[PDB]
Amino acid sequence: MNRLRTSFQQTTGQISGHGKRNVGVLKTAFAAVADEMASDQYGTGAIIEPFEQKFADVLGMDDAVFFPSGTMAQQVALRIWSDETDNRTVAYHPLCHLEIHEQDGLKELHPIETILVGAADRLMTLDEIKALPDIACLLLELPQREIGGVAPAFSELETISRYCRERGIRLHLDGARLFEMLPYYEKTAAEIAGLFDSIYISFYKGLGGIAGAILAGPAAFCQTARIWKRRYGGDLISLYPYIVSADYYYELRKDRMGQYYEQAKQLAEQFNALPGVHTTPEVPVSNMFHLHFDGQAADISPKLEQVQEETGLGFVGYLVDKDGYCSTEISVGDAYGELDQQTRDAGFARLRQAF
Amino acid sequence: NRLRTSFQQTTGQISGHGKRNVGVLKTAFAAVADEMASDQYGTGAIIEPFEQKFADVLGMDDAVFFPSGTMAQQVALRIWSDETDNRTVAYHPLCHLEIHEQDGLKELHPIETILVGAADRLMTLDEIKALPDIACLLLELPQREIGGVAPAFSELETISRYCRERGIRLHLDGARLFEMLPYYEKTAAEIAGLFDSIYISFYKGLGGIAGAILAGPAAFCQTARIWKRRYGGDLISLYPYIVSADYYYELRKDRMGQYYEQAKQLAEQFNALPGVHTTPEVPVSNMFHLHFDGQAADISPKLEQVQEETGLGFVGYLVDKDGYCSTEISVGDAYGELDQQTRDAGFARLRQAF
Numbered sequence: 001m002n003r004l005r006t007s008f009q010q011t012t013g014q015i016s017g018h019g020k021r022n023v024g025v026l027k028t029a030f031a032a033v034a035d036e037m038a039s040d041q042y043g044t045g046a047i048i049e050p051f052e053q054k055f056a057d058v059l060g061m062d063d064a065v066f067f068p069s070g071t072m073a074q075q076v077a078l079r080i081w082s083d084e085t086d087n088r089t090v091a092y093h094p095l096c097h098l099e100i101h102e103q104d105g106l107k108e109l110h111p112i113e114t115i116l117v118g119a120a121d122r123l124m125t126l127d128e129i130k131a132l133p134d135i136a137c138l139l140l141e142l143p144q145r146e147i148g149g150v151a152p153a154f155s156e157l158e159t160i161s162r163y164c165r166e167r168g169i170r171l172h173l174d175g176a177r178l179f180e181m182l183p184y185y186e187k188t189a190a191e192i193a194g195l196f197d198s199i200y201i202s203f204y205k206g207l208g209g210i211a212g213a214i215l216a217g218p219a220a221f222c223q224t225a226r227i228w229k230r231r232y233g234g235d236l237i238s239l240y241p242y243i244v245s246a247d248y249y250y251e252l253r254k255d256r257m258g259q260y261y262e263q264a265k266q267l268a269e270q271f272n273a274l275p276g277v278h279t280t281p282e283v284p285v286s287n288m289f290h291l292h293f294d295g296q297a298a299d300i301s302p303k304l305e306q307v308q309e310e311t312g313l314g315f316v317g318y319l320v321d322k323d324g325y326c327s328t329e330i331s332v333g334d335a336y337g338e339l340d341q342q343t344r345d346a347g348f349a350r351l352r353q354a355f
Numbered sequence: 356n357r358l359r360t361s362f363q364q365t366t367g368q369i370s371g372h373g374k375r376n377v378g379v380l381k382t383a384f385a386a387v388a389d390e391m392a393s394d395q396y397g398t399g400a401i402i403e404p405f406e407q408k409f410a411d412v413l414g415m416d417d418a419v420f421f422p423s424g425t426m427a428q429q430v431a432l433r434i435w436s437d438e439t440d441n442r443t444v445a446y447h448p449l450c451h452l453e454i455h456e457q458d459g460l461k462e463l464h465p466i467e468t469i470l471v472g473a474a475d476r477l478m479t480l481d482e483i484k485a486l487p488d489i490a491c492l493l494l495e496l497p498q499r500e501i502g503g504v505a506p507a508f509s510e511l512e513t514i515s516r517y518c519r520e521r522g523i524r525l526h527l528d529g530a531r532l533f534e535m536l537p538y539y540e541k542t543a544a545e546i547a548g549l550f551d552s553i554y555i556s557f558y559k560g561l562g563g564i565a566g567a568i569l570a571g572p573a574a575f576c577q578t579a580r581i582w583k584r585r586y587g588g589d590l591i592s593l594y595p596y597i598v599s600a601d602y603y604y605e606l607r608k609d610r611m612g613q614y615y616e617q618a619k620q621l622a623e624q625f626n627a628l629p630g631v632h633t634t635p636e637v638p639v640s641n642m643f644h645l646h647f648d649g650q651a652a653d654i655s656p657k658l659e660q661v662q663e664e665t666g667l668g669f670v671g672y673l674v675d676k677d678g679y680c681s682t683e684i685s686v687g688d689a690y691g692e693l694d695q696q697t698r699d700a701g702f703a704r705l706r707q708a709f
Contacts, residue, residue: 021393038376204591233425
């Protein structure tokens with residue numbers, strides 16, 4: 001383990017995240033669950049059916065399917081739409097999860113090609129979407145996490161939804177971070193989800209569960225999704241350990257996304273005041289942003305190390321070197337709100353002394 | 356369904372480990388500290404020690420934890436198809452990949468399957484010898500769908516040396532490997548060592564919740580970890596399954612002998628009933644199939660009642676066949692929790708009903 005990561009691990013509080021990712025997260029979700037509650041069974045029965053209906057309702061879709069991962073969930077979605085439209089081409093942002101974080105799973109597992117829309121360092125434009133040829137599916141990710149978490153205005157999404165529909169293109173939402181976006185949009189999950197044909201949501205990002213996903217959409221779409229779920233080896237006999245925990249952290253945190261967002265905006269303001277330091281976006285539209293430092297990790301890590309060792313407050317857990325700067329991702333959760341004012345003020349003065 | 360109900364409502368059973376409920380997870384976690392670090396996307400805490408543990412148990416270079424055997428085994432077949440430039444694999448007609456996975460192997464991979472033998476029996480060595488060049492032969496020990504029948508160890512040896520001769524990779528579906536060791540009088544390592552790759556399960560005989568290990572050569576496992584991510588099986592945190600798998604492995608690893616002996620006890624009681632038999636006649640593991648003369652219409656009422664009256668579960672479902680109906684029995688911890696007299700009074704009532 002490197003010096004920076006070490007120093008962040010040995011902190012007693014953090015600005016980002018929910019706390020340590022440990023066995024206690026599962027034990028806490030289960031501590032009041034009756035030992036006699038019956039397990040789900042290969043994608044039906046107890047626990048799973050009510051959870052799926054719940055989240056079909058939350059997203060305002062005909063049905064919803066619990067998956068072990070969003071990786072599996074979104075590959076399946078795209079394949080279903082590709083099959084329905086007899087079109088083997090899908091389009092999305094160049095830094096889409098399916099493109100860069102799944103060992104090319106979509107393309108290795110299905111005869112599907114991808115058009116990367118726009119540029120890597122920005123949102124795709126409405127003109128770029130209108131310039132697309134006949135494709136099966138456009139995937140949008142709200143927000144675009146890989147560029148710090150930027151998203152189009154709600155009215156832009158309305159226009160894209162009408163366009164695609166008027167053109168026969170299926171619109172899929174990568175809503176890994178959908179809950180996080182609701183404060184800024186001033187909309188419910190169903191109002192955002194209603195613009196799309198299908199939706200993926202996660203239970204381990206903003207919500208801070210352990211793992212697992214929901215893919216939601218029309219009834220027939222979900223039926224097919226359940227067959228692919230079995231083909232993929234995701235139709236486990238028992239997925240309750242993730243469903244019970246998922247629902248628990250959902251009920252726990254569904255109404256905290258607003259505070260996480262206000263807090264993120266506060267943190268960004270503090271960071272942007274530092275010489276040699278900025279956020280992207282400058283003003284967050286959610287609980288997240290990227291934090292950029294001029295100079296490379298070999299220059300900046302030691303400063304952060306010292307700051308963190310001394311204060312016992314985690315600002316930065318890792319850096320990623322880029323061209324003349326280095327970057328880390330901040331996502332605000334329960335951890336920040338456990339830092340009292342004096343603990344924030346003392347950390348930030350010490351951080352101010354470093355930069 | 357009324358039979359299922361009658362079975363679910365019993366306070367003891369001859370089959371299985373007991374109710375599949377949340378308690379099974381909480382029991383496994385009762386002694387794990389809250390502060391234990393999660394695994395992280397296939398590496399780190401919990402997962403690495405588990406994989407190393409099961410590489411050693413199976414005598415292989417490495418091992419990889421999978422959320423399922425459906426996923427594990429498909430991945431193993433593809434890696435061998437790739438390593439061999441051969442797009443055909445072979446196995447028994449009721450192989451789990453053929454009948455219980457919605458054609459996943461063939462839908463997700465440019466692979467074709469040859470079925471070796473006849474559905475109702477073990478394949479023969481001559482049938483293996485008549486196979487064209489293939490990437491992989493998969494053997495299931497025992498063949499579950501025909502009652503749990505398996506070839507003598509000398510025959511497994513012959514077959515392994517033959518496939519080594521022809522450059523055919525040999526893979527074991529070992530979902531029930533542990534249940535067989537008593538019969539074989541062999542270690543897991545001694546059985547596994549006749550194969551190129553091995554899949555084992557943590558929810559069959561061991562009675563955990565879910566999860567699988569795929570073990571094999573270091574190279575093979577590296578590539579299998581890539582496919583695990585492609586598949587969406589490389590979850591940020593698999594510890595709920597891993598920790599529970601270990602809990603139950605440790606708890607039940609040395610009980611396969613008693614399950615096998617207990618299985619034999621049950622089949623003996625069953626075969627002595629008129630209008631009842633088992634396949635195989637004498638179990639070679641903790642399992643067998645149970646056949647009742649007559650159709651489910653005639654038989655399911657009789658079972659239903661015996662179970663309602665006794666509160667002892669013998670049978671939870673019947674499959675209707677020509678002139679008889681069948682069910683699968685797999686002994687775990689539930690048999691041992693019913694005292695002898697209680698099982699004797701259940702059988703006695705059963706004896707009256709048949």
